Design a protein around this nucleic acid. Structure first.
Ligand SMILES: [Mg+2]
Ligand SMILES: [Mg+2]
Ligand SMILES: [Mg+2]
Ligand SMILES: [Mg+2]
Ligand SMILES: [Mg+2]
Ligand SMILES: [Mg+2]
Ligand SMILES: [Mg+2]
Ligand SMILES: [Mg+2]
Ligand SMILES: [Mg+2]
Ligand SMILES: [Mg+2]
Ligand SMILES: [Mg+2]
Ligand SMILES: [Mg+2]
Ligand SMILES: [Mg+2]
Ligand SMILES: [Mg+2]
Ligand SMILES: [Mg+2]
Ligand SMILES: [Mg+2]
Ligand SMILES: [Mg+2]
Ligand SMILES: [Mg+2]
Ligand SMILES: [Mg+2]
Ligand SMILES: [Mg+2]
Ligand SMILES: [Mg+2]
Lengths: 67, 188, 260, 131, 143
RNA sequence: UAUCUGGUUGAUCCUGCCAGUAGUCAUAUGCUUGUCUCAAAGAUUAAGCCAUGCAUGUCUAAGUAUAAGCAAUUUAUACAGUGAAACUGCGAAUGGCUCAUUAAAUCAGUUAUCGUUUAUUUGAUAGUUCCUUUACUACAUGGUAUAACUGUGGUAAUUCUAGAGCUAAUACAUGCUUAAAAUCUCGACCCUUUGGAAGAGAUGUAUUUAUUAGAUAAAAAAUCAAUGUCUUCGGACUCUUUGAUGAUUCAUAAUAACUUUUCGAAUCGCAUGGCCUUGUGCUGGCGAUGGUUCAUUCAAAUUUCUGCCCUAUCAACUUUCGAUGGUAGGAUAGUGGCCUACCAUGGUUUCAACGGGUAACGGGGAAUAAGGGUUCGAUUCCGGAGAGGGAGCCUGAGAAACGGCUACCACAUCCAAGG
RNA sequence: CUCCAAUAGCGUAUAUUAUGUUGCAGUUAAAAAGCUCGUAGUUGAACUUUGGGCCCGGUUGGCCGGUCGGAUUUCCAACGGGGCCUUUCCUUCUGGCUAACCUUGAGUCCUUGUGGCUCUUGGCGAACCAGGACUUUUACUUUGAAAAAAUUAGAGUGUUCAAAGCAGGCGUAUUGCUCGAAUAUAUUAGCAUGGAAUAAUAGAAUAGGACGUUUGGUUCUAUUUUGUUGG
């Protein structure tokens, strides 16, 4: 159980540094809170929404021009 | 420090091993001597069991042995002139085994002219008796003759001087001499 | 585990000392000596357990330090001295001499011998070599080292050693028809004669012994000790002579020995 | 660290608590020989199960097999000595007889009562356990 | 292999402590040592007469053969002086009551007194650690 | 899924179905708990944190006693019984505890060391030591430099220690004695020979290198070298030693030298014998301790062959920075890419490599069982690994030691704030 | 208040327990890929010494029972085993155990005896010693050795019974005698061994083959004898 979750990790620092190295090599083969994820995703949806809403409004004004 | 464990090495499939124990004493390795030339000193390590080893550093004479004639003389090593493993140890004059050195010629010439009376180069009636009793064997070689005319002979080291403190050796003769002359001078 | 061990937990003792579990937690661990660890017997398992002279493992020490017990002529005091196969334990008071030989169940017998037999023992050579300054030696099974042996002595010949002088007195070669006492493995203590011997360059040359009721068996040569010609042995064998009865005949014997 | 002093339990629960033939049988037994609970009966049925199975597993040998002759004479000698088996019925076959009442008749309590120094079964148990 | 032009490398090659003497002039011209590997294997003629120098050859070198003697078919000869052989066996799975084919490659040392190609059956014998993965010398070449 | 009870309608039979009905032996928990024998004590995947105490020291007749310690009274004016302290030696590397890491790793059976270290124990083993070996050099026995002790002190504090004065050794540092020959080298000699010749030097053991021997499969001549025993002066070569293993450049012996020269007893207790020229003359007993190398023993380190749970929706991996191999060196107790320099391009893989998961230390073993199997094994024995985490290392035969030291991360104790 | 069950023990919760090698199912109600080709994998027809003849006896079973509860003698019944001979290498040679009576000089105890044996004048090559000289390789299967102790099964034994333990027992108990601590198991790998059915493997097709007292030399290794060590 190499990369487990130990009870206290500040008091196991030399250990976790060594494990970081082990992982680096063995998977350099491939390298070569989810509420923070939910919050980031919702924020980015919101920003996209507001930019699209802005674009929509400017074009509807320009369509008022050519009625 | 410097260990001789093989369990830090990739396994023969190319795998990568997690270590299961700390370094052990019985796997150690100390520092190379890098034993230069000049003004003897020797430091004695205590190895396993008790068991001295005499790590030599800066040694300058050796018991070089003339194999064909069957003798040996303590002469003075004068400089590494070729080394098979590593061309750096030439540049920095480091005595390891199989280093090709130049020694002294003078004890050997003195001995030879004592043993046969032949004066390498170009009365006490017992002495005439012996020298004439062995004059068929008064024939060395063409090449070693020329080295004796120069003043210093090529010689190989055959004692590990970081392990026993003594840089003995032997004098090149025969085909080994032709090989090393060719190598040494086809570098130059 | 960083150094030699020093305690031996009872239940890891040799099975043939017959040490009862639940009497303590550890067992006498033999010191280094002539005989190996698993195939010795300390003097405390011999004085206390077997002969019932001591009651504790302290009265054993108060026997050994009065200079009473001697193994092979020389008086020994280390209470876990590894006595072994073919030794001669002399006790001066009680006028007794024992020799440690096996018996067909595998144990070590209590086998009293007479006095004039108690002044030699047999030793199977284990190597012969040129020692130092060109002096040949033999190395018997109990660690001895004897210089200047008779040049017809080679590996596996049984030598007969005089305890006082220490010199070799006699020897016995290794060939078919020789009487053989087996000290090792599953047939530990059986006495037969040799019948054949298989070569096996490379490992473990086997030997076909046949006892005196015509039951052949095979052991490695390593486990074979030669103790005399056909008929005549040189040591005195224990009672029962090495026969290896079978358990139905053992019970018919016991039951028919119903004497009271 | 010492060596373990081994042990093992001498009785075992049967298949089913109720099976009214079993309750009626145990009542006949524990009332006739003057017993205390069901563990006495189950202990004897555990003994007799062990006896009868090891004797069965002998019968699936062949005559003049040394293992069968040795342990058969052993088992028969023991069951003769306890008194459970007879003196004339000394073949291995007859121990596949031997119902529980044969054991519970050699019990010391009933043997006091049968010798007529006890006037009942329960009076015998009380003379026994009062020294 | 060793590939004649024997003095190819950056150091003179010779059997240690075998000294041919310039103050005598015989004709065999190189004194040569060879041992007997034991166990009924034969020193091939190419070791007794040849001019290669190998220090891990069982017949003209400083190893010795002891312990397990194995066999197998050569499966690749692409390294210098060593090869890889391949042993096959059948492993018994007792639940299913059947067997399964298994195999192990093994790297072994082939002295240049032998001529070994691929597909070729060989008998090897155990010597001390010769390199990181090599613990075996080819001692006879069969087919 | 047997057994038993019940429901399935207006009833009763017979089918069928449905519900309830069983030991488990694991965890948690409740109520009860008098006698005899016995013996156990894990768990938050928290290998999380620890107040206080204890768990490792040791003396015989036989290493060192002027305690200004104690007792004497019996031959003890160098000492002599006992005996703190301290020096020296040995031990603290065993035991006890835990299961975090670890998936060909550990471990289990089986090999190897012709590839190495070994305190101790047991058995062997050591007439050679300086010198042109006579103008001496202690061998009836050589030299300092410290502890405890005395004395002057520092600091809040610790199993902190400084400065001065003593004195020891089985500490430390030095350094002698003995057989008889034989053997080679250098040889003053005289007299020329076909040559012999006084003497002088070296010879133990260990180390380091070079060299030699360590044989063996059966005829005879011609050939010279050269005459070596006998010379029967021509020559016959007449008689010719040599261990082990499957196997060696093995054991072992020999030659030439080398070495900041290893060992070859300045030690200790009880006894007091013979001698005979009576000298404090000559020898001499039972032990203790130490010592070189070889073997043995307790061990160690490496190592051969076969054997692991889940995963392919993990198919290519290792190779810059050793990955597979060759040569040489260095390092090690020793083999070895174990490391270095140069060179080659190899090595494993659908017979599942590599990479993940493991509430994975491995085994003996425990349970259920008609069997095949399936599950459990921190846990009384063996093997490994660890001592909060990582990295170093000292002394020693033995340690990468934690009831040893040193630094760093994490915790945390005392403080006069300096430690 | 009356029963019932277990009883110095008894209850409740949660779990768990009574995938198919042996040994499952796939038309109609779990599940045959739409189709063919195809590498790994698994699997693959028959065939090579068969058969007879002679001798030897094991171990049973029957007639038997000689005896003071089995010591065993005549037979045939079967069952396993061996050795010859039938075209049947049974590896070849080295001086030896010469193996063995193929070898021979005389004698006979005893039912009339091919029902029964002591010593030796050319000998026998296979007694395997050690020695050489080499030989197709597996799978399977028997047997041996191995796989520590405790644990497990199990023999003995009145721990007062029992769980256990490995103790104990018997006398002249006034000075001492004796039995024990058995046995089996353990599967894969490694070692050793008999078997030669089944299933693979490999030899003589360009004959580069095999035996051979043959006769060309090319060669190299060195035993002995030429003083003796070198040539
Ligand atoms: Mg320990
Ligand atoms: Mg061997
Ligand atoms: Mg009471
Ligand atoms: Mg993994
Ligand atoms: Mg894996
Ligand atoms: Mg000694
Ligand atoms: Mg001072
Ligand atoms: Mg040598
Ligand atoms: Mg190397
Ligand atoms: Mg490199
Ligand atoms: Mg597990
Ligand atoms: Mg774990
Ligand atoms: Mg465990
Ligand atoms: Mg540790
Ligand atoms: Mg903790
Ligand atoms: Mg120590
Ligand atoms: Mg540590
Ligand atoms: Mg602690
Ligand atoms: Mg500790
Ligand atoms: Mg295919
Ligand atoms: Mg077929």
């Amino acid at each position: 159980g190499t990369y487990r979750k130990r009870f206290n990790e500040k008091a196991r620092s030399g250990h976790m540094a060594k494990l970081k190295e082990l992982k680096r090599i063995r998977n350099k083969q491939f390298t070569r809170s989810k509420v923070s994820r939910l919050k980031k995703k919702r924020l980015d949806k919101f920003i996209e929404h507001q930019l699209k809403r802005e674009e929509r409004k400017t074009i509807i004004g320009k369509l008022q021009d050519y009625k | 420090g410097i260990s001789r464990d093989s369990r830090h090495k990739r396994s023969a499939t190319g795998a990568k091993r997690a270590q299961f124990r700390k370094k052990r004493k019985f796997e150690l390795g100390r520092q190379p001597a890098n034993t230069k030339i000049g003004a003897k000193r020797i430091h004695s390590v205590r190895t396993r069991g008790g068991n001295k080893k005499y790590r030599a550093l800066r040694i300058e004479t050796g018991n070089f042995s003339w194999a064909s004639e069957g003798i040996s003389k303590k002469t003075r090593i004068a400089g590494v002139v070729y080394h098979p493993s590593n061309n750096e140890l030439v540049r920095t004059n480091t005595l390891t085994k199989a280093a090709i050195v130049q020694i002294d010629a003078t004890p050997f010439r003195q001995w030879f002219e004592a043993h046969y009376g032949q004066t390498l180069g170009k009365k006490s009636k017992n002495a005439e008796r012996k020298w004439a009793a062995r004059a068929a064997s008064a024939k060395i070689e063409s090449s070693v003759e020329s080295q004796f005319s120069a003043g210093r002979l090529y010689a190989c080291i055959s004692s590990r001087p970081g392990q026993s403190g003594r840089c003995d050796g032997y004098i090149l003769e025969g085909e080994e001499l032709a090989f090393y002359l060719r190598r040494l001078t086809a570098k130059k | 585990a960083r150094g030699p061990k020093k305690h031996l937990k009872r239940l890891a003792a040799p099975h043939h000392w017959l040490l009862d579990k639940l009497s303590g937690c550890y067992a006498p661990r033999p010191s280094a000596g002539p005989h190996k660890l698993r195939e010795s017997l300390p003097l405390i398992v011999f004085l206390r357990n077997r002969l019932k002279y001591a009651l504790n493992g302290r009265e054993v020490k108060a026997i050994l330090m009065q200079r009473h017990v001697k193994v092979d002529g020389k008086v020994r005091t280390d209470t876990t001295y590894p006595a072994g196969f073919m030794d001669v334990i002399t006790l001066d008071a009680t006028n007794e001499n024992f020799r440690l030989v096996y018996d067909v169940k595998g144990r070590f017998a209590v086998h009293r011998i007479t006095d004039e037999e108690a002044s030699y023992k047999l030793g199977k050579v284990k190597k012969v070599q040129l020692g130092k300054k060109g002096v040949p030696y033999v190395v018997t099974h109990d660690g001895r080292t004897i210089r200047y042996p008779d040049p017809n002595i080679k590996v596996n010949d049984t030598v007969k050693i005089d305890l006082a002088s220490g010199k070799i007195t006699d020897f016995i070669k290794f060939d078919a028809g020789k009487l053989v006492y087996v000290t090792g493995g599953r047939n530990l203590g059986r006495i037969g004669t040799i019948v054949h011997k298989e070569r096996h360059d490379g490992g473990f040359d086997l030997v076909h012994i046949k006892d005196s009721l015509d039951n052949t068996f095979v052991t490695r040569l390593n486990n074979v000790f030669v103790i005399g010609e056909q008929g005549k042995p040189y040591i005195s064998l224990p009672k029962g002579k090495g026969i290896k009865l079978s358990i139905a005949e053992e019970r018919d014997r016991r039951r028919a020995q119903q004497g009271l | 660290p010492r060596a373990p002093r081994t042990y093992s339990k001498t009785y075992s629960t049967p298949k089913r608590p109720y099976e009214s033939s079993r309750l009626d049988a145990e009542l006949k037994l524990a009332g006739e020989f003057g017993l205390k609970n069901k563990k006495e009966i189950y202990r004897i049925s555990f003994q007799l199960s062990k006896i009868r199975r090891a004797a069965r597993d002998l019968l699936t040998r062949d005559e003049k097999d040394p293992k069968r002759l040795f342990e058969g004479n052993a088992l028969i000698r023991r069951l003769v000595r306890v008194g459970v088996l007879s003196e004339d019925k000394k073949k291995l076959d007859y121990v596949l007889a031997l119902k529980v009442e044969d054991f519970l008749e050699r019990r010391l309590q009933t043997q006091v009562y049968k010798l007529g120094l006890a006037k009942s079964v329960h009076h015998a148990r009380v003379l026994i356990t009062q020294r | 292999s060793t590939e004649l032009t024997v003095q190819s490398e950056r150091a003179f090659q010779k059997q240690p402590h075998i000294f041919n003497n310039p103050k005598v002039k015989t004709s065999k011209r190189t004194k040569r040592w060879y041992k007997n590997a034991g166990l009924g294997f034969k020193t091939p003629k190419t070791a007794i007469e040849g001019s290669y120098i190998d220090k891990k050859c069982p017949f003209t070198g400083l190893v010795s053969i002891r312990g397990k003697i194995l066999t197998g078919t050569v499966v690749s000869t692409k390294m210098h002086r060593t090869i890889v052989i391949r042993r096959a066996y059948l492993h018994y799975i007792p639940k299913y009551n059947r067997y399964e084919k298994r195999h192990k490659n093994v790297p072994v040392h082939v002295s240049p007194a032998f001529r070994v190609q691929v597909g070729d059956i060989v008998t090897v014998g155990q010597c001390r650690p010769i390199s990181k993965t090599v613990r075996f010398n080819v001692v006879k070449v069969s087919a």
